[PDB]
Amino acid sequence: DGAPPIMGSSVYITVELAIAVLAILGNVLVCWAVWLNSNLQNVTNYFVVSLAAADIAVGVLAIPFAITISTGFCAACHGCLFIACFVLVLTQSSIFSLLAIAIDRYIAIRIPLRYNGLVTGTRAKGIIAICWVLSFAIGLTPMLGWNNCGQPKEGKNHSQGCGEGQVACLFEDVVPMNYMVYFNFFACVLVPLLLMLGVYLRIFLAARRQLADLEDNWETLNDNLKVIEKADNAAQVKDALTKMRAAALDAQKADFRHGFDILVGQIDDALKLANEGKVKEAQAAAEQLKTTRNAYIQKYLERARSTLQKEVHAAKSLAIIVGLFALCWLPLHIINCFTFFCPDCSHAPLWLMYLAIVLSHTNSVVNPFIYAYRIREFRQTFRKIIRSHVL
Numbered sequence: 001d002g003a004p005p006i007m008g009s010s011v012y013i014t015v016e017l018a019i020a021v022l023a024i025l026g027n028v029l030v031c032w033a034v035w036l037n038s039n040l041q042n043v044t045n046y047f048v049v050s051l052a053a054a055d056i057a058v059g060v061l062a063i064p065f066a067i068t069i070s071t072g073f074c075a076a077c078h079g080c081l082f083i084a085c086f087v088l089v090l091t092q093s094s095i096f097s098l099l100a101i102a103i104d105r106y107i108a109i110r111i112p113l114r115y116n117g118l119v120t121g122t123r124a125k126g127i128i129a130i131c132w133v134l135s136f137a138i139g140l141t142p143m144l145g146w147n148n149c150g151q152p153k154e155g156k157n158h159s160q161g162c163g164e165g166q167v168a169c170l171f172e173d174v175v176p177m178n179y180m181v182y183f184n185f186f187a188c189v190l191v192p193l194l195l196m197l198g199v200y201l202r203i204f205l206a207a208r209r210q211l212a213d214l215e216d217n218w219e220t221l222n223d224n225l226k227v228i229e230k231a232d233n234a235a236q237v238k239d240a241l242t243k244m245r246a247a248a249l250d251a252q253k254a255d256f257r258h259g260f261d262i263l264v265g266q267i268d269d270a271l272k273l274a275n276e277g278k279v280k281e282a283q284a285a286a287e288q289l290k291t292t293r294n295a296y297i298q299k300y301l302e303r304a305r306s307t308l309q310k311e312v313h314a315a316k317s318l319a320i321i322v323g324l325f326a327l328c329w330l331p332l333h334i335i336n337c338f339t340f341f342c343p344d345c346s347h348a349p350l351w352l353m354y355l356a357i358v359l360s361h362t363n364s365v366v367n368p369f370i371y372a373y374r375i376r377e378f379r380q381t382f383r384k385i386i387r388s389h390v391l
């Protein structure tokens, strides 16, 4: 019978409302930016908007629900559940959006060739609708009978003076911890997180191998070239050109058709000279390759390299989003593991719980900062919106 609970409550409520303000405003800005900047209207950013929608709803609904449930007010058992579990629906929706973004970027880097034919806005819209419906079904599963409404706290319900059937609106009293640990954490959160880790691993490895391939083809072009200038045999020259020719048309698979046709044509010219024993003609006809290389091949192998670099830098930016999600949500999941798995442990203290709850809510405010910071197109669009509207 120490400090009045209203004092602790005041800090918690004030902080929660400060978070709600920032989650709403920042994520409204993201949606506004995607709405009037056609450079941002792609499939990838439709999942960004779905993710922003979930974070707006955290400020508008989940946080007010969190404040309400903290009071332990007397209400319907299934009413409490909805208040208690709605945040999950939003958290699950966030998981699906993050997973979809990963797969989208994976498809884009491995088969850029058939990316626009496979991944369309119409199909993305259908994927998003389905994921929202699945998120409701997963998040509100306790309302289907997996709850403690059948086992009410006799003592608490009489202390608070609830009516008949009514019950305080506690979180750990109505939502079973085996649902939270096994179903929600392990299956619905941790498994998708590990899948996202895997997808991003492949993204970075695919980028690393492609770059390499081009570097190998580029060095193959120039070495076989230097072998040409020193050889003394007709077949010695013909060997370095057939190997230079394979590397020519393979680098071609990674306006510019002209650059590669002059190159491969010049190699074939030098080939028939070599076959007819005309060594010095072959060596001199192969020496004009280096100006075709310096006027086309070099120009395309820098441009392909900078495109891959941008895809890597973009993938890193999106991976940070997933990292901060895990950082904000793992403490709460870990606390629940201790509650569930260690009955010999005294329960984590109230101040720590609420610190972990506050931390999970702040994850819906760092997003917009990552965007404007990591992605130029977002930053420039926010700049314009801020400077124009409503000034």
Ligand SMILES: CC(C)CCC[C@@H](C)[C@H]1CC[C@H]2[C@@H]3CC=C4C[C@@H](O)CC[C@]4(C)[C@H]3CC[C@]12C
Binding pocket: 061, 074, 075, 076, 078, 079, 080, 082, 083
């Ligand atoms: C976005 C719009 C829909 C506003 C959010 C709708 C919310 C506020 C609605 C949907 C279901 C409603 C709840 C349904 C059941 C109960 C149990 C009752 O003993 C107290 C009221 C309470 C807790 C209701 C409060 C309001 C409620 C939570």
Ligand SMILES: CC(C)CCC[C@@H](C)[C@H]1CC[C@H]2[C@@H]3CC=C4C[C@@H](O)CC[C@]4(C)[C@H]3CC[C@]12C
Binding pocket: 334, 337, 338, 341, 342
């Ligand atoms: C990135 C992933 C693996 C994070 C999840 C790690 C979790 C599941 C690990 C990390 C530390 C572990 C806990 C360490 C201590 C205890 C106390 C013991 O009496 C019950 C098990 C329990 C509660 C462990 C359960 C599993 C645990 C919570």
Ligand SMILES: CC(C)CCC[C@@H](C)[C@H]1CC[C@H]2[C@@H]3CC=C4C[C@@H](O)CC[C@]4(C)[C@H]3CC[C@]12C
Binding pocket: 330, 331, 332, 334, 335, 338, 339, 345, 346, 347, 348, 349, 352
């Ligand atoms: C994933 C990263 C952030 C590590 C997680 C840090 C926090 C959440 C971890 C580190 C040490 C953990 C605590 C270790 C000891 C106890 C005492 C036990 O009676 C209740 C759980 C509690 C209070 C644990 C809760 C979770 C905990 C506080």
Ligand SMILES: Nc1nc(NCCc2ccc(O)cc2)nc2nc(-c3ccco3)nn12
Binding pocket: 170, 171, 172, 180, 332, 333, 336, 350, 353, 357
């Ligand atoms: N354990 C828990 N508690 C609460 N609220 C109740 C906090 C509490 C803690 C102790 C106590 O005696 C009474 C109430 N919300 C919670 N949300 C979550 C959660 C959300 C997502 C994953 O876990 N876990 N969680």
